[PDB]
Design an enzyme around this catalytic site. Structure first.
Site, PDB file in Angstrom:
ATOM      1  CD  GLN A  99      51.438  21.035  55.223  1.00  0.00           C
ATOM      2  OE1 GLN A  99      50.885  21.637  56.142  1.00  0.00           O
ATOM      3  NE2 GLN A  99      52.657  21.353  54.786  1.00  0.00           N
ATOM      4  N   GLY A 126      75.542  28.735  41.213  1.00  0.00           N
ATOM      5  CA  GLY A 126      76.148  29.446  42.319  1.00  0.00           C
ATOM      6  C   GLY A 126      77.634  29.150  42.253  1.00  0.00           C
ATOM      7  CD1 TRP A 127      82.636  29.500  45.275  1.00  0.00           C
ATOM      8  CD2 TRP A 127      82.939  30.872  43.532  1.00  0.00           C
ATOM      9  NE1 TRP A 127      83.992  29.611  45.060  1.00  0.00           N
ATOM     10  CE2 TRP A 127      84.205  30.447  43.995  1.00  0.00           C
ATOM     11  CE3 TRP A 127      82.875  31.743  42.437  1.00  0.00           C
ATOM     12  CZ2 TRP A 127      85.400  30.867  43.402  1.00  0.00           C
ATOM     13  CZ3 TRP A 127      84.065  32.158  41.844  1.00  0.00           C
ATOM     14  CH2 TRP A 127      85.309  31.719  42.330  1.00  0.00           C
ATOM     15  CD  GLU A 183      78.714  32.818  40.975  1.00  0.00           C
ATOM     16  OE1 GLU A 183      79.742  33.066  41.642  1.00  0.00           O
ATOM     17  OE2 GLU A 183      77.568  32.796  41.478  1.00  0.00           O
TER      18      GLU A 183
END
Length: 435
Positions: A99, A126-127, A183
């Site tokens: 895989q 994100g923050w 953000e």
């Protein structure tokens, strides 16, 4: 035609990249719990932006502290390298050597295989990883480069070679869109140290979203596919104005956006308990006006701008923020410090808070909290979830959102919301499901 909705409403859930470790929360739990059947979109958090190249990238470097902690940070291992045993995977089969894709990316791929209406989005930023958005969106050239790199990595699924995994098209077909979590643009209200241009971030951000829209559609036309673009919308009106989040033009780029309905207050103010996710303004809040928020205040600002309500959603919390040494049961009372948490200080999962001390619900403010005489926790429960979902319906919004899935492992809150959606009048969302 199949749509990525629950009776016309979205129910978005954030999946934390780091949750597979200590919290031991993996995609399989979403399947066996029945929670995935109640979700329409899963936002994988997060994808970082390289401080040096200003592009999306894949690396294996721990997030540090200080002003340079996020430089080159990433977890390719959790993303696609980590191998899952047969008793831990969604499919029930172990990841094999052949895989090219493993990790949570493959686990989510297996989850999509059992939920035809479910979409998986890659949340950028994100923050903690918003430091480089300002510079990356500075020019037409930088914006083109960033967008191209993100689509190549996540949408086309071209991953680098890592721990016997990766390669061109390794993650093909898994991501149905990109979710932008800057953000916050045009203001220093975000993490200290983030790149910020109070003068140009607003216009540059509008241009950035437009470039994402343009490139996503260009690629979608080559393979007859329709990718979506979303973003995490702020609750603080100051942030809304600073980034032009309520500019209708931005919603010609974004398919939809989920509004911040949590983190409205927290232990960062260790001596004052209060609501972190109140639906309505609270007359009892004693703080300065510029610090008082509510989900309703934010929602109304976006609606006042003329933004189509079907392109909006309201976020709820699957965790609580707490204080210790809390003298009173009533909110906005004195406390001495942040309360102990199972995984993070002053933060606790709904699964643990639902049995902590005594539960409290205030329909007037659309809030809930736990109190045991010492610890006071602000969180969302079945009551606030039902009230907020009724609100989503009554305001004509497109759906709800959750931060973050590991806090409600049995999907009690996610389910209460979806149950409401299925019993309500058909929602306004007609977003097509993945092919």
């Amino acid at each position: 035609p199949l749509t990525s909705t629950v009776n016309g409403y979205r129910n978005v859930g954030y999946f934390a990249q780091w949750g597979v470790y200590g919290r031991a929360f993996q995609a399989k739990q979403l399947d066996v719990s029945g929670t995935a059947k109640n979700l329409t979109h899963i936002n994988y958090s997060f994808g970082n932006i390289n401080n040096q190249t200003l592009t999306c990238f894949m690396a294996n470097k721990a997030q540090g502290t200080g002003p340079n902690g996020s430089d080159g940070a990433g977890d390719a291992w959790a993303d696609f390298g980590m191998g899952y045993a047969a008793d831990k995977s969604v499919s029930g089969k172990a990841d094999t050597w052949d895989q090219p894709l493993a990790g949570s990316f493959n686990q989510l791929k297996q989850l999509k295989a059992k939920n035809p209406k479910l979409k998986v989005m890659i949340s950028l930023g994100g923050w903690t990883w918003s430091k480089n958005f300002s510079k990356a969106a500075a020019t037409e050239a930088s914006r083109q480069k960033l967008v191209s790199s993100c689509i190549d990595l996540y949408i086309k699924g071209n991953l680098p070679n890592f721990e016997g995994r990766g390669g061109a098209g390794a993650a093909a077909g898994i991501f149905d869109g990109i979710d932008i979590d800057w953000e916050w643009p045009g203001t220093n209200s975000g993490l200290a140290g983030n790149g910020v241009d109070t003068v140009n971030d607003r216009a540059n951000f509008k241009a950035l979203l437009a470039e994402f829209r343009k490139q996503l559609d260009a690629y979608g036309s080559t393979n007859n596919k329709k990718y979506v673009l979303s973003a995490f919308l702020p609750a603080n009106p100051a942030d809304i104005d600073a980034g032009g989040w309520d500019d209708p033009a931005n919603f010609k780029s974004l398919d939809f956006g989920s509004i911040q309905g949590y983190d409205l207050h927290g232990a960062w103010n260790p001596t004052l308990t209060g609501h972190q996710a109140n639906l309505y303004d609270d007359p009892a809040d004693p703080r300065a006006p510029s610090k008082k928020f509510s989900a309703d205040k934010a929602v109304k600002k976006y609606l006042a701008a003329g933004i189509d309500p079907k392109q909006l959603g309201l976020g709820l919390a699957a965790y609580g923020r707490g204080w210790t040494g809390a003298k009173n049961v009533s909110p906005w009372g004195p406390a001495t410090d942040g309360a102990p948490g199972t995984y993070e200080t002053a933060n606790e999962d709904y699964d643990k808070l639902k049995t902590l001390g005594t539960d409290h619900y205030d329909a007037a403010t659309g809030s809930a909290w736990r109190y045991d005489g010492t610890q006071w926790w602000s969180y969302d429960n079945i009551a606030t979830t039902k009230q907020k979902t009724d609100y989503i319906v009554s305001k004509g919004l497109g759906g709800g959102m959750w931060w973050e899935l590991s806090g409600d492992r049995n999907g009690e809150l996610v389910g209460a919301m979806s149950d409401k959606f299925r019993a309500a009048a058909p929602g306004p969302v007609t977003e097509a499901a993945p092919p």
